[PDB]
């Protein structure tokens, strides 16, 4: 009974956590170590 409300709540929480983890993953993926100092020497 009232399975709809449970379905809505679980969907919302799951997508929210998915959004947070995915945006954090995208963030940490594209870090820039600087591309300078000795990195100049290594290009």
């Amino acid at each position: 009974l009232e399975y709809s409300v449970v379905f809505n709540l679980v969907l919302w929480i799951m997508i929210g956590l998915a959004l947070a983890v995915i945006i954090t993953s995208y963030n940490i993926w594209n870090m820039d170590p600087g591309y300078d100092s000795i990195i100049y020497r290594m290009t």
């Binding site: 983890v21 993953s25 940490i28 870090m31 170590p33 000795i38 990195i39 020497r41 290594m42």
Partner: protein, 103 residues
């Protein structure tokens, strides 16, 4: 020879991936009260994303530190020292995973 240092330690993330995975591949059954099942889901995703965290940090930091060791040999000590915390993080993941796999 120094090139191998961060990679042997990178293997520990995979070791941890086996730690709970094999444990639960052995301890699984059919007549489950459906709540321990949830606990195991939580443990697995926790240790896994901790593996992601340790992998990210180890890759980038071992990279940068081994550049700075290829230039300055003194940097080696700090390279190892900073490397410590990545496996500390993976350890924290495995801690919570074992607690949930046994609670």
């Amino acid at each position: 020879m120094k090139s191998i240092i961060p990679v042997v330690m990178a293997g520990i993330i995979a070791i941890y991936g086996l730690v709970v995975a094999v444990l639960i591949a052995n301890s699984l059954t059919d007549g489950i009260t459906l709540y321990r099942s949830f606990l195991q889901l939580g443990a697995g995703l926790s240790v896994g994303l901790s593996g992601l965290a340790a992998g990210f940090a180890i890759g980038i930091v071992g990279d940068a530190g081994v550049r700075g060791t290829a230039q300055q040999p003194r940097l080696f000590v700090g390279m190892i020292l900073i490397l410590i915390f990545a496996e500390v993080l993976g350890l924290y993941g495995l801690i919570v995973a074992l607690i949930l796999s046994t609670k």
